[PDB]
Symmetry: none
């Protein structure tokens, strides 16, 4: 199943654009949250989305900053999905899921791509 | 036109497999060099290949490490090709000649990936 | 010599602090501009600054976002300075230009960090 | 205290030189192992070195490949040292201080470099 997670910190932001982007990549169920990205500890709706997905599912966000504004916490969340065998897709960067080289190079490059995006998220 | 550059340190390194790979991806002429990738200074065949290509041409390699094992020189070579309006194609990285998703973020990440691979190539 | 560029979009930003920081890092003249970082085309003072510096000089900014909030244009400006043989220093990242003797901590690191911060400046 | 870990897979490799390298960088005690770097499961001497070091100590290797030729396990080992508040130093690339001048950027860059070195080590 393809699942989306949407987040805005306030209603001023274009939530509808975000929802439309998730739909474009085939999100069948979308969990929508109005909260800051500062912490994962204060986001029950993200926690429901993460508990909802199962092995073989796809978990989609518009950008990694929707998951969180904290590098460490974003990495922890991506690791959770990785462990659960749930594919992460980022609509603003659909290139990320393409295979680069052998299984070693690919996992390493994916690690770096996520870390680059997570770093950008916090740096902003 | 599509022009290939192939490189091995020794004929033990299955150059056949590399050549037939460039042949598969459309290389009309392949410049083949038996030399270390550490330096461009002792690679006259690379120099000849770079001299040969012009605006509108395609310059193809199997992987970044074939082009070289020297971050500074490989990036200089990538920039030379960009300036000369010759498209660099990497047969193991067909994503580089594509624009998917947000065109800006796509270009940004693909740029960093090229740099990471050039660095990995020197480190190896 | 050491030349600074300072920019604010509004006089309610801390322009004095920015100028004080550039002075501390040895700027002998500071070209000061009140304008958006979105475009170089409407920023004659940045252009004056770039025209002023010559081979051997140092061009300093407090942060990459002062130079611009346009990824392509910041990279272009960075590449312009490089090609003019003018060293770019970012006062908030003072350790960047120290030569270690290994690409991992020199050109590779600089390229990566500059590009990340340029993207961050636009996406913010 | 400064502790070294030295490893060779065979006595064909210059073990004496690796030891002298660690002593040069001030290792007071060196844990020396003759074994493949493929796995941590058959490397009791590495486990002893990791168990030996305490908060405030420094753990040194000549290069990451000495520590291991297993991306996952090297990362795990480096994470273990981090949590123990034991400083890792690679004599061929000392990175104990800040390399940029910003805590997020420094953490990111160090993580990225370690990953490059750990990946290459396994690929070799």
């Amino acid at each position: 199943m393809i699942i989306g997670y949407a987040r805005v910190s306030s209603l001023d932001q274009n939530l509808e654009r975000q929802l439309e982007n998730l739909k474009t990549f085939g999100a069948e169920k979308i969990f929508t949250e109005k909260q800051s990205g500062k912490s994962i500890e204060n986001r029950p709706i993200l926690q429901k989305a993460l508990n909802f997905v199962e092995m073989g599912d796809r978990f989609i966000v518009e950008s990694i900053d929707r998951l969180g504004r904290n590098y460490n916490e974003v990495i922890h969340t991506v690791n959770y999905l990785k462990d659960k065998e749930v594919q992460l897709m980022i609509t603003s960067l659909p290139m990320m899921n393409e295979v680069i080289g052998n299984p070693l190079l690919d996992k390493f490059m994916k690690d770096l791509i996520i870390r680059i995006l997570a770093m950008v998220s916090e740096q902003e």
